[PDB]
Amino acid sequence: RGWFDILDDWLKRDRFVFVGWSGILLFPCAYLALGGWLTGTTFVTSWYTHGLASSYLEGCNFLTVAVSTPANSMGHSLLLLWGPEAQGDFTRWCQLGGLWTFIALHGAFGLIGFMLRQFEIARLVGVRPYNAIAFSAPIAVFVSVFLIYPLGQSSWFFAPSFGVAAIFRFLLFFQGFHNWTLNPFHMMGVAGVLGGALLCAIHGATVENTLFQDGEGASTFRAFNPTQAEETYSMVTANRFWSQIFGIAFSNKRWLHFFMLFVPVTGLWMSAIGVVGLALNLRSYDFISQEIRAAEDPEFETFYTKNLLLNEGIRAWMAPQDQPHENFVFPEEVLPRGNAL
Amino acid sequence: NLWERFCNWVTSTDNRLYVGWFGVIMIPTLLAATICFVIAFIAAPPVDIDGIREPVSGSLLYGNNIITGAVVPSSNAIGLHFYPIWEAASLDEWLYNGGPYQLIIFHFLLGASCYMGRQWELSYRLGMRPWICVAYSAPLASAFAVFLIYPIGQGSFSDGMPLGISGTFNFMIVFQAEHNILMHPFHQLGVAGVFGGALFCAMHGSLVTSSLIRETTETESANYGYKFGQEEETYNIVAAHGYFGRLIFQYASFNNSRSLHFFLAAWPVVGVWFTALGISTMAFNLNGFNFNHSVIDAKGNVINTWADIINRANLGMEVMHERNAHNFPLDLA
Amino acid sequence: RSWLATSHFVLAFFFLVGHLWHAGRARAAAAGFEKGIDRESEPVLSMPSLD
Amino acid sequence: EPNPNRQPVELNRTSLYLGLLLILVLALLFSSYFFN
Amino acid sequence: MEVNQLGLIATALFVLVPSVFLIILYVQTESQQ
């Protein structure tokens, strides 16, 4: 048969865990990314890159551990273990943030391997590859946020650190410096995510509340047969219910499920486009007309101007510690603050 | 009998939009709230939300756009006091103190509760199972949390969420400043709920679309392979289960469609339930986790964590929010 | 006061949810369709179209 | 000789409503930024 | 308010061109039988 055909036969054998050709890329990279995150959050400090404790060994909990980004002076270095910065020293590599680049690159290639796995299994079992197309949106989000955004900025330092409180810092940083809530691409992302959650809940509840009685048990989960030819719920009844409640209703199941695909994927793609715009600092920060009016009229106030004052507070009060490489020394008298507080 | 005829019309399943008795309450309140919202969003004068005689402009005619416009919450001088139109001396006083916000939110909360009841009512009239309203109770609880319960806990309807986009962003940022909602586990459960809801929505849609049974040509849309009211299933759930069971592993895949759709209903509903409860429990000032200065070295020096960076951002928002409204060091409410 | 107020708001909301669940289920079980729609006697199929 | 690859194009009323909703909502979202 | 003057034409064309495109397609769909 040839070594290639025998190997292909072995890789595509039915197992508990399917491997496939894509497994060779997926399982090493994904395993290493997950193990690197656990190893970093368990043992590795951020003391030399950020001046932060970020591991269980330093006393942080699950919410506050992170594998932090490299220092700003490293730039966009790949920070290979054998690279010119670490020079093969594993301890120094961990101290310089090399675990972050390790996790980011291994995660990117793991996500590539997972979408290739989706394509390979879809080809093998004979189904259309819409799951891989749907998974393109998480890949777009990861590439825009963890790769494209720091590449646009000065260094890997301003990428998200792999941690819970670190991601919360990333959120607040984007609010304070980018006004990311005011960005219409992020608004489309929020619309896609919340609409996907709404569609998930509403479709599940609608199916569960229009089920046909196909059993005598009060618990209706037993009444479904996996190989049955009939629909397990009434589409006509569901359509009439939502037509009389909401005004409009689905009447095509295939269109319904494509719509369930379409909404969160499109939202995530729009948010990725907005994140690329923020990678170049092309923000939707301000409305120029409102700035002109508020500058020339000290009585004009909107919630947008209040949000701008909040962003000024965020920037001034978080900049010295969130960006220690700048050596920001902001005296107390220059810090913006309201009365009393 | 006239009353019997009216009862037959109200509960009729042949109306294009079902009314029901929950509808006889729902329709006037929602119409009043909608009309007042449109009129206020377009043409309301500025509103002294903080009670400090510094009115905030929220309508389109007074210099706002779609993003920045809002119906501004009622005055902090009002607090939790009931402020209808007839309690004001004039409409200009009512508009100055933020009366439209109270009218809109009270009518909307009544109408949305009756919307939940109406969902039950139509499900009962059609012979359905009744728990779609239970699913709708999660966004309804969220609306009650941000419009009623948070003002009740804080003691003023001025701290309720403004009826606008930028006002909503202001609500979020000030809430993070004062309650550390990101570090609250109920909000983390809510984020898990909405992220998982989007994930499982895309997953279920892509798996059903992937396993659609061929009933069309390449020329026509695949959606025409389904006919409304057909008995046969339009997709092969066995093929989709085989695909997903090879994607992760077999026992992580649902083979029961009823169990799968119950999971689809249950995950975001429970998550949003918990985040609405988070907003209410932070309304009673049970705030998120405080890990400021938690990590201490041997000498006693504070070793900062990411929680301390979050604390710096929260301090910035705290010192800048409502910059003229505070006279005393502590922001107790 | 914070502990009692927060805990009892959580409990009161969940009990409102439970009331909705059991009230709907009691209505459906008394009316005889808590286990689903009978295929041979689907009510919507016996109703005129909305449009 | 007619081209044999010509095909009829269809857009149903539901697709028209959905597309008009998409266009109008996108315009309502982006109009404030277009005016700035 | 000192808005962008091309804002009006941008928004107007942003509405009209895809809208009239969809209207063209729908009306020609209805006239087929």
Binding site: - | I42 | D51 | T14, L24, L28 | M1, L8
Partner: peptide, 30 residues
């Protein structure tokens, strides 16, 4: 002209709501 634009787009959305509810394609059982 910006306020007129916003109100016009909103009014077109509400008109589309009316036409989508009351002048939809009627779902026919098959």
């Amino acid at each position: 002209m910006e306020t007129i634009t916003y109100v016009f787009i909103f009014a077109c959305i509400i008109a589309l709501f009316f036409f989508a509810i009351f002048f939809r394609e009627p779902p026919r059982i098959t």
